[PDB]
Design a protein around this ligand. Sequence first.
Ligand SMILES: Cc1ccc2c(N)ncnc2c1
Lengths: 381, 104
Amino acid sequence: MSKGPAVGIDLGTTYSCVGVFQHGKVEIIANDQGNRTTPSYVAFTDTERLIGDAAKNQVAMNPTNTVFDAKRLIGRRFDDAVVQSDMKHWPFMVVNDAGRPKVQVEYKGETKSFYPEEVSSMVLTKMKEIAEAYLGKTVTNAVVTVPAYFNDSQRQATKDAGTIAGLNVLRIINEPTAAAIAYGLDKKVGAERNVLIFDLGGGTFDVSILTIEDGIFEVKSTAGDTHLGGEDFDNRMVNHFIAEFKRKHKKDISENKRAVRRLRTACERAKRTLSSSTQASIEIDSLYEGIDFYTSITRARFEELNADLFRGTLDPVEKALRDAKLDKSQIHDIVLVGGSTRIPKIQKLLQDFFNGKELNKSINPDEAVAYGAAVQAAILS
Amino acid sequence: SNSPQEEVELKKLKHLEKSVEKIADQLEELNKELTGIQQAEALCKLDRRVKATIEQFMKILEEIDTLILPENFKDSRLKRKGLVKKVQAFLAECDTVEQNICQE
Ligand SMILES: Cc1ccc2c(N)ncnc2c1
């Protein structure tokens, strides 16, 4: 294989993405399964190690030895509050090893431990491989993203993952900054620009305010909810449906894991449909005790079920403006990142708060940070 | 009144029926090995397989759920319910294997 170009890699909490700059355009590379995003999942089975779709697709069969959310652990101490709180919810074991966290799994019959940056290297390895399969050339040089709030430890532990994966990390860039690069915010004529990056997706919510002068990006404030995401919207749809089944049939399907899953999978398709349609239909044959479940959901009802969560996304924006010492009128640009910003209501709420200011959403909100990261990789080539 | 549109749906269901026949064969093999043992360590080796068979069946039900069929498409609607009832019966067989193996 010939020497290839530099790639941009968005290393995320729940999903990762890789992009390349070729023929004056950014191409988001699809994986072996044909997907433009790969889950940040690594499974250790009795026979092998699976990464991405293959690891996620078998999580139900091997919950304990399937690792995900390494980004929540990377660069942090074991006694860190986030680590203590988060581990109370994972199916996998997190152990203390001289003050540092390690994840304990069963790989090929043996009990093994991996550091968060070792698990992240395995995901970065899969991104490099996804890019090589597409280009038919060897990839080494890459730009990897990190959230603007990552400290010195968290930034280096990520650089370390790139190194363990065999990548030449050209630069480490803030995700919010890479979102501004994608929309060419830096190349805009005039004075300093105040930019707000609205990130809702990949199981986290991140508001970022940056000011760019002379091609310089400065984080003026970060805010958000570390546990808010699409899945929270889903639960509200599932509860609405569970209670609807109780009303129409007087049976509780909540205690049946398979009924709830069939329903959950159907709610994720419905929520997605409700981003482009005013109604979504669900037809599940023999959902519970032989009863068929044919129902429909309005965009209005979906919005009402998540009204508190949706409005609540604006408190973080307010918190960040107060910290950056800026008025809403001083924000030059609004950038939407993450899939959950595809929701019409979130868009409406944000545009109204900014008194009708048009939002930057042209680039796929899941591919936005990886697009910029690939633009930056071309510049450093 | 038989429509060309219904043929598209019927073909989707025929593929799903064929996928179920593939998974069902795996389960038959599993049942045979479990019957074979019943004639401990061997049982947790079957655990990995019965869990995978369960998952393959769960992914089939998830795919079937993505289909929205018009009442007019009667033959397809009947084929769907049949397939769901067929899969659920296999899932009960799965659960029997699972409840017998890895018992303390
Ligand atoms: C089309 C589409 C894709 C993804 C999402 C999503 N992640 N959350 C909400 N709405 C969506 C809509």
